[PDB]
Structures are given as structure tokens and as C-alpha cells.
Design an enzyme around this catalytic site. Structure first.
Site, PDB file in Angstrom:
ATOM      1  CG  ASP A 119     -10.494   8.542 -21.283  1.00  0.00           C
ATOM      2  OD1 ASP A 119     -10.205   7.328 -21.336  1.00  0.00           O
ATOM      3  OD2 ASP A 119      -9.631   9.441 -21.213  1.00  0.00           O
ATOM      4  CB  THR A 126      -7.095   7.911 -16.767  1.00  0.00           C
ATOM      5  OG1 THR A 126      -8.524   7.981 -16.794  1.00  0.00           O
ATOM      6  CG2 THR A 126      -6.590   7.388 -18.096  1.00  0.00           C
ATOM      7  CB  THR A 127     -10.837   6.177 -13.257  1.00  0.00           C
ATOM      8  OG1 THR A 127     -10.892   4.759 -13.441  1.00  0.00           O
ATOM      9  CG2 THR A 127     -11.393   6.863 -14.475  1.00  0.00           C
ATOM     10  CG  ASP A 169      -9.065   4.044 -23.592  1.00  0.00           C
ATOM     11  OD1 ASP A 169      -8.335   4.974 -23.993  1.00  0.00           O
ATOM     12  OD2 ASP A 169      -9.866   4.173 -22.644  1.00  0.00           O
TER      13      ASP A 169
END
Ligand SMILES: Nc1ncnc2c1ncn2[C@@H]1O[C@H](COP(=O)(O)OP(=O)(O)O)[C@@H](O)[C@H]1O
Ligand SMILES: Nc1ncnc2c1ncn2[C@@H]1O[C@H](COP(=O)(O)OP(=O)(O)O)[C@@H](O)[C@H]1O
Ligand SMILES: [Mg+2]
Ligand SMILES: [Mg+2]
Lengths: 55, 521, 529, 89
Positions: free
Chosen positions: B58, B91-92, B388
Site C-alpha cells: 500500500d 495513493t501511489t 481497498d
């Protein structure tokens, strides 16, 4: 010895040639220490303590 | 000079040298998470001071565990939690897009361009980029019930493609979807319990349509009472059923032994009254947050009924929601409504532990996961991938609009901005053009990780999009391009929209900094 | 070698580690330089194009600010001369709310120019007299520059144009959206009868989407969660208690004493029955929600759930008082059935989630209510706080507009006119006080220079063009920002204004700071510790 | 000016890092050592190990889980083999 370390500092390992060496040295050491007190004509030992107040 | 304005030890820097150094600083942060993107991405292993190790994929989790102190880099950390707290996925993506925005305008800052001109450029395209996404998003407002159960599965699988459990994504997606459709209309995250028991294969995970929790500390006599029922009635309590002193503020003064013996028998008569009140209600399983004494357990053993004490608060609330009773702090009004009914109760062994199972409730509003791994970090990483999937389904319920992933969406936006910059004159042409170039980092980082020719694939993608093939992305297995909407690569429209605004706001804030002053200590 | 042996008198009696400066060279020329350094620090943070600034305090906290008063508070200064300017700027913020940077630029420029006058032969006594006369002459001119008026301060459309300029210098690019929000909140907490209080505007920051998704809520919102199983109410009658929701006990020490078997058994039953009646009596009046400022009991919670009573807890001694105003209820110090007068009302109470956070919402359908709250949504904590400071600056402007309704042109058009008219008066004053008067008028130019510098254009071209136009009789011509080539523009027609009271206090406090420093002749300092 | 020492991480000097294939190869060498230590103890003709405790206690054992439990290791991959043994047990 593998270049990668697996043990924390202070831990030690011994293997076949060295392990059987150490185990046999210890056993005969205790066996020969007490052979003098065996049989009708064995002698006695003196035990004096450094920790237990010189008992 | 002899009296200095600010205290000694104050650090002060400014100008172009300060601003360029901030741009290069953010490149290191985007480097730590660069190769964790894609169906063929890796993980990272981080060890803190005490020696505990964490293995994670994550993106938001990695940045938290780093001890970043650079003030400009901390902006990229915060937007990671922003995407984490709103949509939970991406998030990335919001991090790579942030760094690429800054790197593509870095030479202009060296030429002396005024940052306020740069800021106006970013805010112009974002309103164009966001309004483009909403136009071409695909949705079906007609309410078909089986299409909804298929759309949510496709969204759930695509969120599990880059995780440790990719080989079983089809199995887990069915479990996750079933969890959410029966979780009320507010969807509290506490209504889902995730348990972790060591030992066993990954395919041994299960979902129980009820409540299951761990065995608690039990006193002598717990073992002579039955461990299975068919139609029990559950009596939930918040009352401590053990022999004790009434009030901490109490005091007894007495003159004669006749009253003394009467007082001693008074405490027992109090305790036996409560336990006789419960037994008459017809309940078979009793649960209480407070301790249950050994006397109660031995008493509950003599009548073939089950007791449990020190149950956690959260596990009790789920049990009430699944069975349909209510917590009672007194034993004087046990009506037939305050009891809970289940279709079967049992106690089983799971990987060395003992677990209580309440299954068969037809009116349940709660599920519980039992995860089987092989090591502590194996199930912790498993639950982070499950979270997620849960959040993605929750957002998809409120808005069922999807777009094709795999880089297909980043090339439609870049082509659109390139066809709009040529219309306007001035330095607004170079800035928007540089912005449209930063949007093709996602398709490049997918090919770089897998191991293809990233240059050739981009050329093929750019020609297909400009030919007029809106949903063409990358084909990981075939090392080529293909339509990802007919290949079932979907994601909700919220993930990309929240990705741009946070990325655009972080780039604008950092460029708008003039000087940094650090004072001692 | 030899040594200089510490000439006798006051030098030999002075304690170690202390300092003593005397004369013009060691006292006034040093203080002016120290003040000049402070001005250059925040000079780049002036105007709509003023660049942000990043400050890390001694507690590793991070601040990105454009506000000048905020920067000075977190910057820590050690020179006494600079501290005097800091206290002057903080006073101006408290009295007005905006114009904390106009003080620093003006007070800094005045001292720099007074250096050369002392350098060419004037004394400190004559400089002060010249400055003070201009300060009195400046105020007499000022009312003649009023060019607009605030008509109705409860008209949403008009007010948004009044606050736009006060926000244009803080969030260039989003001034329209933020102006509309604050207008809605301020216009609907307004009282008829006067006294706009400022504390009645609440700001709640929630992490999440961009800033354009923020909105205004006519009521109050808390970051808490419900205790009972009841969650939402549709038409609530509210009872407010400042006492714990539990059976009371004597303040003096009190123990329960039992002497017989019956009293031991009947104590526990008796206590529970008493609690049931007390809660039922409350529910008899019709209350739907109970709010308390203290601890709650388990038995009370169990009976509250049975009688369908929603229960919330919050202990601030300042949030509860605000809640009393919002719903109109009054506090109670003992657990008694509330009187029909003492119960507030609310059109909806519910528990909702926004961006991974649980909140409790007290929403009115009434347009006015008593107080209002603005919900902020951003992507970073640093982004919210700067927007929060902007909302304060916009509100404080509305507070001033209630006190006085007169506006003057901005963008440097006011300072140019003052400099032109003071010099004309300064030409007709014979004596050695004519020089200081002209210097005072010359310091007013720095504000049009400071805007021009940050705009990325040459300052002298603008100043030359402003003077030439103003000679023709245009009192509403000022600097133009949008033009990449230096130019001028009409301010009244462009709707760029600032409060009259903002300038009136700013000039008064700035000069008072300059003349206070010039009056110093020598400095005695004690050692640090 | 371009690359003057700028701090990004707390205690930047004291932290190490391995990237790429040299990361994977280091794990393989650590994993192999644990397997070669316990290759001997397999089958009816296997031999035992004599553990030694923190305080001096002696334990002779042949169970796979116990050897990896009483062993003290530092490499992170080695702890992953220890947790693997316990899960099967
Ligand atoms: N089947 C697939 N084909 C191509 N790309 C995929 C596929 N599944 C996932 N991806 C890619 O994975 C990327 C993001 O993965 P994820 O780990 O969810 O990112 P983040 O960490 O930002 O949430 C997306 O850009 C998408 O292109
Ligand atoms: N649209 C505009 N064009 C030019 N100048 C402006 C505009 N809006 C505001 N200003 C200028 O901004 C100045 C005040 O902004 P600010 O930075 O808040 O200073 P202060 O901190 O002293 O209030 C005013 O002097 C005004 O002239
Ligand atoms: Mg994902
Ligand atoms: Mg202002």
C-alpha cells in the site's frame, strides 16, 4: 561460513567436527574428576566456596 | 552587528536556488514508491527502531513509515493520506502524478518565469481535465439487479490485481461484494469484523453470515456444559454476575449473631435471584461484558446452558445487530423482545484456538472474516488489500460510473489537452503542453516495471488515440495494447477525479513558496 | 604589547555580560538599521502577487503563510528596536484586523529616510516635529478621498463585491468562490438591533476533496459520536444539562449504612426504580434529545435507549454555551424535568460521515438561526489553515463595515494622492521643518513600489505614470496587475476598494512607532539567561 | 549548489538500503542457511540438536518447531522461516 549473518551478537554455533569434540571433552572431564573417590580405598575431596561465604 | 536581529542558529534561504532544491527533493519521495505500481509490482520491507518488520504494498503505508523531515516533501505525504481518507484507492497514482508535474516545469523556473504564471496554468487544465472525465464516463442508470452484482465484482477484482492475493482475486471478490450488499444504508466500517488465525492455506478463508469471536477466560466448571444448540435464545447483558460487595461506599454495623447469619445469607439470596431471573426467561446463551464468576458458571452448568464473560464491546454490538436483541444493565424486565434468536450455535477449533460461532440469522446486518495465513505479516498484508476492496465497493454503491484503466484514461486526457493548447497563444501554450506530457507517466511506469519496450508501446498508444479507440490501455500479458473496457479493467470515476485535484493542489502550493526559515531547536 | 585599561566612571562599575550604547552613532544609527532589516523580510509578502513564506517554529510545526502578522508571531526577534515595531503591528491587527503589512512597510520606510536628515545636520527634535505635523495633515486630507459607500449590509449580492478585494490579496485565483461563502455566512448570523459579534462564525476543517466542495451549514457541527442506539431525529425538542446524567450524591462525604437483612436486599432495587421515574419524567415533557456536559451512567443510558431518547455528551464549557445560543435553550444545573420555556428546537439532528470522519450535525432549516458554521474541505492541513486565515480576514472586514461605511480607492491610488497633497502643503512651510514634511510624503510611495516590484515590472515607470495622470485630476487611478507592461487603471470602476478605518488606524500607529524609536538616546541591556 | 547535502529522512547517515537483484540474492542465502542447519534432522536416522537457553538451561530436542523457536536470529528472512514452522505445527 555463509557471508550472510543469521545470529544476533553473542550467539554462537558449533557443528559436527567441533560439536562432537566439545561434548566428549566435557564428559570425560567429569568422569576423570571423580574416579579418585571410587572403591574401598578411594580418597576424599575438599569443596571450598568463593561465593557462599567461604563455606 | 553586536545585537543581531534574529536569534543565533536561524537558517534562511531563498531565491531560485531554494525553489529548484525543493523540486529535486520531491523526486526522492516518488522514488521510494515508484516500482510498487502495476500487475507486476513489488513490495518494500521496512524495519523500525525496535526491530519489528512491516511488509506492505500500500503506497500510503510506506510513506507513513518513512521519517521524512524535509518540509517540501511532507506535502507529498499528506496528499497520500488525502486519497486514503476519501476513496482509499489511488495513493501511489496521486504521488507519481505530483512529482511529474513539478519535474516538467523545472526548466521554466530556471529561465526565470514568474511562478504565478505557472500556477494559473495548472488550475486552467485541471478544470478542463475534471470536466473531461465526467463527460466520457460510462454509466447505466437503469436499475438492473444482476448487472450491479457484476459491475461491483469487476471493480473489486481490478483493485486486487496488484496485491499479494492476486492469484485468488476471483474468489475474494465474491466474498467482499456479498459483505457490502447486506450492511445497511450507512455502511459503518465497524459492522465488518476481520479476524486473523495462524496456520492454514490462503484458500481456507471463509465468510460467516453472523458473528464469531474468540473464546475468553473461563473459570472452573466451564467444561461440563453443552457446546451446541439448535434454537437457543441469546440474553445479552452488561451486568457483573458474581458474588461481591454491593457498593464501594457501603458499611454494615450489627449487634447480634442472629442478624450476622442473616446478612451472610443475604448476599447469596441476591446472587441467586438474578440467576433465577435469567433462567426463567428461556434463554440458553448468556453474554456479558463484565466478568462472570465461577459460581454462575457452575450454576449455568447444572441446567445445560452456556455462559461467557468479558466479551469485547465491539463484538457485542455486532452480535446485537446480527441476532436482534438489546443490551440490558438490569435483570428485571427481560421481555421476549430483548432476546436474540439464531439458527445454530457451536464452538469449533480453528488453528489451535477455540472460536464461538453464531450462524444462521436471516435478518443479519453484519459479516465476519476468518483469514488464514502462515505468518503475522501474511494476514496483515491480506487485510490491507481487503480494505481497498471494501472502500471501493462502498463508493461504487453511491455512484456507479466507471472508466477503463490500464493507462487508457491518462492518454485520453493528454490528447485532449494537446489539442487545446495549440488554440491559445503565449506562454500558456508551453505550460499546458508540459502539463499534458506529465499525464503519460502512468503508462510508462506500468511498462517499465513489467519489462517491455516502454518507448514503442507509448508510440503505438498515442497513434491509436489520435486516430479515432478511446479505451485503449496496456496489455500486460501480451506485451501490447488492447481495449481495457472489453477486457474488464474498470474503476470508479471518483478515483481519477480525486487524483487530479489533490495532485494539482500540491504542485501549486510547492511552487508558490519563496523562502524557508528554520529557527533553532 | 599593552592594553587599553577600561577608562574610569560608569564603565568600571557595570556588571559583566551587560551592554551600554550611547550617542547617535551607537544608538540611533544601529536601531534604524535593525528596523530596516525587518521590513525587507516581509516586504515580499505584500499584495496579490506577494509570494508565500514558509516558517518552522521551535516546536517542529510547519506554517505556510502570506499573512504578515502571523509570520512575525512565529518568527522570534531579539533586537529591542524591532520588537517595538512588532508590538505596533499586533495592536493594529487587534483593533482593525487587516493592514498588518502596511504598518511594517510604512514604519520601515520612515526610519530609513530619517537617517539622511540626521546625516545632513538636522536634530532628532526637529525631525519628530516635522513627522507629527504631516501625521495631523494626513488625517485632515483623508476624508476627502472617499469615493464609494456601503449601502445595505444585508444584501448578499452587494456584500460579496465589498469583501472580494479583502480576499484578492490572500488567495489570488479563488477570490470569487471564497467571497460568496463568507457573504452567505455573515449575512445570515446578522442581528436586527446591531452588534455583529465575530465569534458567532464557526469554522470546521475536514480532510478530503478540493476547496470548491466546501459549503456553509446554518447551525453547528461537532466531531463526536452518539452514545445510545438512537441515531437520527426529524423534529427535535432539546434539553441541555450542565450536570452529569446520573443520580446525584451529597457533596459532603456520604456513605450508605445498613443494619438489617431487608435493607441490604432492598437497596439495589430501590435505586433502579428511582432512576426510571426521573428519566420517564423527562420524556413526559416531549424531549427527543438530551445533551450533557459531563459523565453519563450505564443505567441512565439503558433507560434512555428504552424510552427512545437520543443522548450526546460533550464537555468544553465553551461548545455547550454556543449550543445554548444556537437552539435557544438554556442550561440546567440539576437533573430536573425541563420547563417548556427552557427547551430549544431544531429541524434535524443526525449522525453523518464526511471523509473518513464521524460528525454530529445540528441543522436548522431557518435562514437566520443564531450562529452559522462553514465547513472546509482541502487536501492538506497547511492548505486549510491558510484558507482559515483568509476567512477571518474577510469576516473582520465585514465587522468594520458595520462600524463605518466609507470606502477609499486602493491599489496605490490613495497613497499617491496623499503624497501629492502633502508636498503642496509642505512647500508653503518655511523653516527647517519643511524637509521632514517632504520626507514623510516621500515614504508613501513605497506602497506603490512594493506592489510593482512583486508584479515583476519596473517601479519607476508606474510611479512616473501615476504622477502624470494624477496631475490631470484623476483621483481614482492606480496600479494595474493584469498588464505585463507597466500601466494604470481606474479603481472605482474596477471595484477595488478598502475600508476607511483601515487606513486611518494604519497611519496613526505607524508614525507612532517611528517617533517612539527616534526618542531613544541610549540603551542599557541586561545579560541573557 | 545542485546537490549540497539536504536532509530528507531522520538519521539519514545511519540507515542502509539494498535494491534490485542484490536484495533477492541476499534473501536466498539467508534462507538456505536455515535449511542446511535442519537438513540433518529428517527421517528415522536423523540426529538431534542441543539448545542452550538465555540463562544456561540445556534442552536436547528433535522437533522442527522447537529448534526454530529456541533459536535467536537477526535476519528478517530467518524470522519468516520461524513463523512458517510454527504455523504448520
Ligand atoms: N488488468 C490490468 N491491466 C492493466 N493495468 C492494470 C490492471 N489492473 C490494475 N492496473 C493498474 O494498476 C494501477 C494502480 O494500481 P493500485 O495499486 O490500485 O494503485 P494505487 O496504489 O495508486 O491505488 C492502475 O493505474 C491500473 O492501470
Ligand atoms: N486587485 C488588486 N490590484 C492591485 N492591488 C490590490 C488588489 N487587491 C488588493 N490590492 C492591494 O493589496 C494591499 C493589501 O493586501 P495585504 O497583503 O493584505 O496587505 P495588508 O497585510 O497590509 O492588509 C492593498 O494595499 C491593496 O492596494
Ligand atoms: Mg488497488
Ligand atoms: Mg488585507
Amino acid at each position: 561460513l555463509a557471508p550472510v549473518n543469521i545470529f544476533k551478537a553473542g550467539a554462537d554455533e558449533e557443528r559436527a567436527e567441533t560439536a562432537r569434540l566439545t561434548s566428549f571433552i566435557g564428559a570425560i572431564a567429569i568422569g576423570d574428576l571423580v574416579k579418585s573417590t571410587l572403591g574401598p580405598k578411594g580418597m576424599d575431596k575438599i569443596l571450598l566456596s568463593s561465593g557462599r561465604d567461604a563455606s | 552587528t553586536p545585537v543581531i536581529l534574529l536569534k543565533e542558529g536561524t537558517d534562511s534561504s531563498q531565491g531560485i536556488p531554494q525553489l529548484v532544491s525543493n523540486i529535486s527533493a520531491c523526486q526522492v519521495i516518488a522514488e521510494a514508491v515508484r516500482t510498487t505500481l502495476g500487475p507486476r509490482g513489488m513490495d518494500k520491507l521496512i524495519v523500525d527502531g525496535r526491530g519489528k518488520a512491516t511488509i506492505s504494498n500500500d503506497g500510503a503505508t510506506i510513506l507513513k513509515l518513512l521519517d521524512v523531515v524535509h518540509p517540501a516533501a511532507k506535502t507529498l505525504v499528506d496528499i497520500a493520506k488525502s486519497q486514503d481518507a476519501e476513496v482509499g484507492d489511488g495513493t501511489t497514482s496521486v504521488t507519481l502524478l505530483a512529482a511529474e508535474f513539478l519535474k516538467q516545469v523545472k526548466p521554466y523556473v530556471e529561465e526565470g518565469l514568474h511562478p504565478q504564471i505557472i500556477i494559473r496554468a495548472f488550475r486552467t487544465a485541471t478544470q478542463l481535465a475534471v470536466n473531461k472525465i465526467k463527460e466520457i464516463a460510462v454509466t447505466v442508470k437503469k436499475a438492473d439487479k444482476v448487472e450491479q452484482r457484476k459491475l461491483l465484482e469487476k471493480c473489486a477484482m481490478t483493485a486486487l490485481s496488484s496485491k499479494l492475493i492476486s492469484q485468488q482475486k476471483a474468489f475474494f471478490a465474491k466474498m467482499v461484494v456479498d459483505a457490502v450488499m447486506m450492511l445497511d444504508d450507512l455502511l459503518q466500517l465497524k459492522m465488518i469484523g476481520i479476524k486473523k488465525v495462524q496456520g492454514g492455506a490462503l484458500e481456507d478463508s471463509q465468510l460467516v453470515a453472523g458473528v464469531a469471536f474468540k473464546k475468553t477466560f473461563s473459570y472452573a466448571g466451564f467444561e461440563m456444559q453443552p457446546k451446541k444448540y439448535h434454537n437457543p435464545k441469546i440474553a445479552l447483558l452488561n451486568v457483573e454476575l458474581e458474588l461481591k460487595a454491593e457498593k464501594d461506599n457501603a458499611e454494615i454495623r450489627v449487634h447480634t449473631v442472629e442478624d450476622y447469619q442473616a446478612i451472610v445469607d443475604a448476599e447469596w439470596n441476591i446472587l441467586y435471584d438474578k440467576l433465577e431471573k435469567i433462567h426463567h426467561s428461556g434463554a440458553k446463551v448468556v453474554l456479558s461484558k463484565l466478568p462472570i464468576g465461577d459460581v454462575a458458571t457452575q450454576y449455568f452448568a447444572d441446567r445445560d446452558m452456556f455462559c461467557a464473560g468479558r466479551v469485547p464491546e465491539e463484538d457485542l454490538k455486532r452480535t446485537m445487530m446480527a441476532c436482534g436483541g438489546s443490551i440490558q444493565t438490569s435483570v428485571n424486565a427481560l421481555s421476549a423482545d430483548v432476546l436474540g434468536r439464531c439458527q445454530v450455535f457451536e464452538e469449533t477449533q480453528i488453528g489451535g484456538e477455540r472460536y464461538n460461532f453464531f450462524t444462521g440469522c436471516p435478518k443479519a446486518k453484519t459479516c465476519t472474516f476468518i483469514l488464514r495465513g502462515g505468518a503475522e505479516q501474511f494476514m496483515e498484508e491480506t487485510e490491507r488489500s481487503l480494505h481497498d476492496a471494501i472502500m471501493i465497493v462502498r463508493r461504487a454503491i453511491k455512484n456507479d460510473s466507471v472508466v477503463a484503466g490500464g493507462g487508457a484514461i491518462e492518454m485520453e486526457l493528454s490528447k485532449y489537452l494537446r489539442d487545446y493548447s495549440r488554440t491559445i497563444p503565449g506562454k500558456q501554450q508551453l505550460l499546458i503542453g508540459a502539463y499534458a506530457k506529465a499525464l503519460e507517466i502512468i503508462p510508462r511506469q506500468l511498462c517499465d516495471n513489467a519489462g517491455f519496450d516502454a518507448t514503442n508501446i507509448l508510440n503505438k498508444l498515442r497513434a491509436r488515440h489520435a486516430q479515432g479507440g478511446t479505451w485503449y490501455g496496456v496489455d500486460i500479458n501480451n506485451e501490447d495494447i488492447a481495449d481495457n473496457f472489453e477486457a474488464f479493467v474498470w474503476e470508479p470515476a471518483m478515483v481519477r477525479i480525486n487524483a487530479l485535484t489533490a495532485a494539482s493542489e500540491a504542485a501549486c502550493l510547492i511552487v508558490s513558496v519563496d523562502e524557508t526559515i528554520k529557527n533553532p531547536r | 604589547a599593552l592594553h587599553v585599561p577600561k577608562a574610569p566612571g560608569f564603565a568600571q562599575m557595570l556588571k559583566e555580560g551587560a551592554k551600554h550604547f550611547s550617542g547617535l552613532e551607537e544608538a540611533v544609527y544601529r536601531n534604524i538599521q535593525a528596523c530596516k532589516e525587518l521590513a525587507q523580510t516581509t516586504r515580499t509578502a505584500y499584495g496579490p502577487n506577494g509570494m508565500n513564506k514558509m516558517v518552522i517554529n521551535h516546536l517542529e510545526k510547519l506554517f505556510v503563510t502570506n499573512d504578515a502578522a502571523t509570520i512575525l508571531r512565529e518568527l522570534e526577534v531579539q533586537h529591542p528596536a524591532a520588537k517595538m515595531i512588532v508590538m505596533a503591528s499586533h495592536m493594529q491587527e487587534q483593533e482593525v484586523g487587516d493592514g498588518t503589512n502596511f504598518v511594517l512597510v510604512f514604519a520601515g520606510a520612515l526610519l530609513e529616510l530619517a537617517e539622511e536628515l540626521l546625516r545632513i545636520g538636522l536634530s532628532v527634535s526637529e525631525v519628530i516635529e516635522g513627522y507629527e505635523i504631516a501625521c495631523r495633515k494626513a488625517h485632515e486630507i483623508l476624508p476627502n478621498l472617499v469615493c464609494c459607500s456601503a449601502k445595505n449590509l444585508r444584501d448578499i449580492d452587494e456584500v460579496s463585491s465589498l469583501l472580494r478585494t479583502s480576499i484578492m490579496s490572500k488567495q489570488y485565483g479563488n477570490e470569487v468562490f471564497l467571497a460568496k461563502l463568507i457573504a452567505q455566512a455573515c449575512v445570515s448570523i446578522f442581528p436586527d438591533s446591531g452588534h455583529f459579534n465575530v465569534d458567532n462564525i464557526r469554522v470546521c476543517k475536514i480532510l478530503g476533496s478540493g476547496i470548491s466542495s466546501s459549503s456553509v451549514l446554518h447551525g453547528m457541527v461537532f466531531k463526536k459520536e452518539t452514545e445510545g442506539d438512537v441515531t437520527s431525529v426529524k423534529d427535535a425538542k432539546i434539553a441541555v444539562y450542565s450536570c452529569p446524567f446520573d443520580g446525584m450524591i451529597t457533596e459532603t462525604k456520604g456513605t450508605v449504612l445498613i443494619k438489617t437483612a431487608e435493607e441490604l436486599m432492598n437497596f439495589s432495587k430501590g435505586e433502579e426504580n428511582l432512576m426510571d421515574a426521573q428519566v420517564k419524567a423527562i420524556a413526559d415533557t416531549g424531549a427527543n434529545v438530551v445533551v450533557t456536559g459531563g459523565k453519563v451512567a450505564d443505567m441512565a443510558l439503558h433507560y434512555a435507549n428504552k424510552y427512545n431518547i437520543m443522548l450526546v455528551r460533550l464537555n468544553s464549557k465553551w461548545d455547550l454555551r454556543r449550543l445554548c445560543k444556537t437552539v435557544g435553550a438554556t442550561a440546567l444545573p440539576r437533573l430536573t424535568p425541563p420547563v417548556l420555556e427552557e427547551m430549544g428546537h431544531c429541524d434535524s439532528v443526525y449522525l453523518s460521515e464526511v471523509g473518513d470522519t464521524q460528525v454530529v450535525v445540528f441543522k436548522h432549516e431557518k435562514e437566520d438561526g443564531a450562529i452559522s458554521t462553514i465547513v472546509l474541505r482541502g487536501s492538506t492541513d497547511n492548505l486549510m489553515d491558510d484558507i482559515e486565515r483568509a476567512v477571518d480576514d474577510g469576516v473582520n472586514t465585514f465587522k468594520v463595515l458595520t462600524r463605518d461605511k466609507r470606502l477609499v480607492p486602493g491599489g496605490g491610488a490613495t497613497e499617491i494622492e496623499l503624497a501629492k497633497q502633502i508636498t503642496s502643503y509642505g512647500e508653503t512651510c518655511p523653516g527647517l521643518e519643511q524637509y521632514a514634511i517632504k520626507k514623510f510624503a516621500e515614504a508613501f510611495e513605497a506602497i506603490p513600489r512594493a506592489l510593482a516590484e512583486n508584479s515583476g515590472v519596473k517601479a519607476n515607470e508606474v510611479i512616473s505614470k501615476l504622477y502624470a495622470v494624477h496631475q490631470e485630476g484623476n483621483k481614482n487611478v492606480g496600479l494595474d496587475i493584469e498588464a505585463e507592461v507597466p500601466a494604470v487603471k481606474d479603481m472605482l470602476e474596477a471595484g477595488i476598494l478598502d475600508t476607511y478605518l483601515g487606513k486611518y488606524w494604519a497611519i496613526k500607529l505607524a508614525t507612532n512607532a517611528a517617533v517612539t524609536v527616534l526618542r531613544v538616546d541610549q540603551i542599557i541591556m541586561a545579560k541573557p539567561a | 549548489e545542485y546537490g549540497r547535502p539536504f536532509l530528507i529522512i531522520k538519521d539519514q547517515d545511519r540507515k542502509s538500503r539494498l535494491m534490485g537483484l542484490e536484495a533477492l540474492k541476499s534473501h536466498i542465502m539467508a534462507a538456505k542457511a536455515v535449511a542446511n542447519t535442519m537438513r540433518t534432522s529428517l527421517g528415522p536416522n536423523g540426529l538431534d540438536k542441543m539448545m542452550v537457553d538465555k540463562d544456561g538451561d540445556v534442552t536436547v530436542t528433535n522437533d522442527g518447531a522447537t529448534i526454530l523457536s529456541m533459536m535467536d536470529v537477526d535476519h528478517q528472512i530467518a524470522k519468516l522461516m520461524v513463523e512458517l514452522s510454527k504455523s504448520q505445527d
